[PDB]
Design a protein around this ligand. Sequence first.
Ligand code: NA
Ligand code: NA
Lengths: 305, 305
Amino acid sequence: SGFRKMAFPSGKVEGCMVQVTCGTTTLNGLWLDDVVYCPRHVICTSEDMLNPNYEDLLIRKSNHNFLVQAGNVQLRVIGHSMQNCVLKLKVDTANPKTPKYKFVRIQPGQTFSVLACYNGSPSGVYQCAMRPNFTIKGSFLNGSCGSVGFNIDYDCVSFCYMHHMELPTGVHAGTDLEGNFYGPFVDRQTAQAAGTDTTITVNVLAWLYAAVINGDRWFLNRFTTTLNDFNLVAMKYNYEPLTQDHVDILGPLSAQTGIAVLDMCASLKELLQNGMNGRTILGSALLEDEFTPFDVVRQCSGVTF
Amino acid sequence: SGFRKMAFPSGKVEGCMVQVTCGTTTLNGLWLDDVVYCPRHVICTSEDMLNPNYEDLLIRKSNHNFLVQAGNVQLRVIGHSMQNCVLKLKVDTANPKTPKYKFVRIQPGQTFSVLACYNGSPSGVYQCAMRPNFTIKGSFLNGSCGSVGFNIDYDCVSFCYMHHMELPTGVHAGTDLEGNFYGPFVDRQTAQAAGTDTTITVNVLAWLYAAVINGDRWFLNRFTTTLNDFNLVAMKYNYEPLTQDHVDILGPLSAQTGIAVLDMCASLKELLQNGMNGRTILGSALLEDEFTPFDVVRQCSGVTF
Ligand code: NA
Ligand code: NA
């Protein structure tokens, strides 16, 4: 028993992290087959980032201006191209540790594991959620750019995130592995509005189901509600509106626990309106929204990879 | 910036997890050099666990009764011995993926990463603290026994924990890699008192320093205190007494932030006496005690492995 915020095992991704250097700038790259993927602003100086013309700056670069190091293995760059906000460096050797993988663009509310890296060396792993406003609240120090987020299904690594920037508000923004930013952000050092964030309602409900499975039941009440009535409360507390699709995804959890989704919604409504009265749920004094329904099912059944 | 509960990269440990089967019981083992380490109750049936005589039960076993599988690699068991509560199975092949490693018995209050495994296959990784009462609050389903906790320093893996049992209260107990239990627990299915747990005071203080570094400052007051006066409050709220050794460990954090440790203690005293008034610190509505001072320094400087 027990419930923890759990990241995927990072071994398959550790074997793909490389160090990319262009001039005075170093960051992390992702080495899959014979291509290295990294944020395009590796070609920028500190002054460039204020208003970079990436096409013009990349013209000044040749294959030999990119230094790629995999621990101590030198990679010979034989081609380079810019795809949106990522640089694709063709190297003359395929990574022998390349896992089975896909590139995925995830939806807001979904979760992934981040392997934080510095100078091409992994430092730690943690689980994140893509916020409804397409930011993440991570832990990214200077030099962490190029760190990737991923999910693992059996033997397949689905890469969904590459880190690019820290907004002046302290939250983090990045792209998919095709170089398209999540949200409205651009890779330049300017003030950038993230927009109102909301709480991921279906994730909070899944976590409440996890609480019941593990023995925390005090928040269960004798009330029920309707989808429309609940959504009036959700809007007041800046929660995502619940749809029937969300109700459907929560189906397995409701079957196991015998608690209908609308009954759990009425529990959540009372928590929103009355707080927790200084009590805790799964060791938290706040409503946690970084566990998807799939995350809860994984940890309550024990699936491996 | 940003602060996250971060586990070590698990790659070096993933390559050491094997599946150990004896009769109808399967759990996880740790394959280092030509020795596999696993919990000794792999030799027990469900009925045995009520009152097992491990010496007698092990007599019934021979080398060929132990089946060790590393993914698909068959390991040939050529010797077996019981060291305290662990079984040491000598195999005829040394693990080619054995990292540099040590066995360490950690102190209460220290943290480590857990690689949760099932049937010898890793499923997830998360950070834990060894509670003052020598339990851990993990996520261990049926079949997770043999999962290990570890720390990584540069290229060296320090193994400190092997999971053995879930207490009737839902918390978890295990041994070091020499098979000596942390705390008073034994590997039999009985009621076992864990004893009063306390909050790890030096870890809470280190986390408050992490909060100040990241911009959460609202809890800083214009008060100070003394070590004796603070410890009177700590005792009232079931916190570990703070010693000068703890003050010394917090030295680097106090130097960076310019906040003397006793000033931060006075902040903590006010939080204990008055609560948080519905505010948060680093996204938490509770005082977090699972970050050591070393953990905070690592994540505020960006050390790699
Ligand atoms: Na960068
Ligand atoms: Na067991």
